[PDB]
């Protein structure tokens, strides 16, 4: 159980764990209203706070899904056994959570629905929830086999500076 890697390499390996997880989860919790994570190592314990809007579908009946997820991480990155501990979290104010708003629009569209009315519906929600402004783009095909672009915009926006 030693020694330990250089301080320069210490941050890179943390970043790789922070990033890989964040795309692992997005391919499973897409329908559950995923919105991110926030990792924290704590004394002799890992915390992985799995942020999603509806904790219901994440939990499952008898906590099956959360049990699957913990057993995965325990084998995959070769964690010492029983150190890993998951936690869930529900976010309040869901219209500032761009990641979830975009991935909700996805399943509305892929569910089979018109584009204009769908874009309007998501727009007023993120405006209502609080926001100076907001924007939506849909680039690709529709009504033939040449591509187009469709912008739906309301309020303020910024594009330059820090």
């Amino acid at each position: 159980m030693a020694v330990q890697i250089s301080k320069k390499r210490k941050f890179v390996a943390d970043g790789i764990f922070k990033a890989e997880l964040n795309e692992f989860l997005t391919r499973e919790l897409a329908e559950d209203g995923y919105s991110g994570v926030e990792v924290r190592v704590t004394p002799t314990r890992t915390e992985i706070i799995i942020l999603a809007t509806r904790t219901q579908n994440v939990l499952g009946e008898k906590g099956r899904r959360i049990r699957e997820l913990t057993a995965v991480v325990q084998k995959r990155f070769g964690f010492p056994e029983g150190s890993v501990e998951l936690y869930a979290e529900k976010v309040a104010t869901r219209g500032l959570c761009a990641i979830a708003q975009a991935e909700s629009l996805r399943y509305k569209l892929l569910g089979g629905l018109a584009v204009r009315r769908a874009c309007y519906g998501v727009l007023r929600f993120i405006m209502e929830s609080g926001a100076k402004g907001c924007e939506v783009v849909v680039s690709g095909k529709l009504r033939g086999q040449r591509a187009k672009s469709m912008k739906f915009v309301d309020g303020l926006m910024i594009h330059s500076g820090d």
């Binding site: 301080k7 320069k8 210490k10 941050f11 990792v39």
Partner: protein
Amino acid sequence: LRITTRKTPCGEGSKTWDRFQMRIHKRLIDLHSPSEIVKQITSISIEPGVEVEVTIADA
């Protein structure tokens, strides 16, 4: 940490690059006191993601 790499995949067009940087910071406070009360008080009262490494002796 510097990383100086292409901004264009599949190089074409005017030749451009992109400087990325990460800045680490180190600093250390030396105490001399019993190792118990140190290891007690140290590990608690930390809100952010910031690392700490306790050493037995150095001097």
